[PDB]
UniProtKB/Swiss-Prot annotation, chains A, B:
An individual GO BP term: regulation of DNA-templated transcription
PANTHER family for this protein: HTH-TYPE TRANSCRIPTIONAL REGULATOR RUTR, HTH-TYPE TRANSCRIPTIONAL REPRESSOR RV1474C
Organism: Corynebacterium glutamicum (strain ATCC 13032 / DSM 20300 / JCM 1318 / BCRC 11384 / CCUG 27702 / LMG 3730 / NBRC 12168 / NCIMB 10025 / NRRL B-2784 / 534)
Protein name, as recorded: HTH-type transcriptional repressor AcnR
Result when mutating D54A: No effect on DNA binding
Amino acid sequence: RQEILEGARRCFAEHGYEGATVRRLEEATGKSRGAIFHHFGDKENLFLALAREDAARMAEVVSENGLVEVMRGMLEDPERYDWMSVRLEISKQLRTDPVFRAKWIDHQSVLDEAVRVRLSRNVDKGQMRTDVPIEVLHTFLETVLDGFISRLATGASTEGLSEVLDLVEGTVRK
Amino acid sequence: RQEILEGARRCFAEHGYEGATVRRLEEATGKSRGAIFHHFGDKENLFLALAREDAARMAEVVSENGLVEVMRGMLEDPERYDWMSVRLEISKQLRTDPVFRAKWIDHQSVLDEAVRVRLSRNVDKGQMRTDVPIEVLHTFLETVLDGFISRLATGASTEGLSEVLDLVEGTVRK
Ligand SMILES: [Mg+2]
Ligand SMILES: [Mg+2]
């Protein structure tokens, strides 16, 4: 299972979401079409399980330092850009396919909750600005994150990005 | 040609980039496979010409009010989300395919120049903060824009976004 997810993350990154064929998946994992669908059912579910893994990892990071720290980590990891692209191929599906949408959102919930807890702790400590509702701050942070993912996925340089993150953090602080 | 571009923008929005078949394109335009490839050569070029149109329109907006105004316009236009998605399907191609990359960047140059001119005028007027290099401000704005495109393309609500834009503008001002 862990073997399947690692290999599949590699396969999706290297070949894309449609290009991630049963053939390619067996090739990346060394397991069969049968033992892959056995755990997960279909491609979409294997995808969501990988998304949920990312979400749980990011959630731990957010707990320590925030969404800005997740973004800092992305600057340190250029090898993961290919996987980030995979993630962006699905957007119309995410927006219009209601069952898929709900599943995507549910698989992200650990992260969404970690971000809410973190911001709550910041507010409780008096560290965020209070002239802007916390929910606007939250949407701003999530927007910057999506921006980072997109730019990095599409081949932008890291340049000035660590300074952009300093600006982003400064923007939400008291 | 104008007939072809309008109809093709509709076809790409409704069916996606791969799903935008010759068959579908003729259907959206009322023109032939031959008269479509005649002007533009292939799908990719018809795509780039549409990207260049978007860039020229955005450039005019930026000239008047900035990138924040482009983003405000996106909140007023939910009908264009489908086209925005099309735009995100290509990301690995944009990042790794060097000829395609260069063509994409060239087709965006009118916008890139409009943003640089606008920021230059802001600086000349003393309206931007000067503790953060202008090029960091520029990357921050472009990051927010990519964020907007992504979030809106993937079915986020507009909620709090107009306030996020107020925050974004306030962040770069003196
Ligand atoms: Mg922080
Ligand atoms: Mg402005």
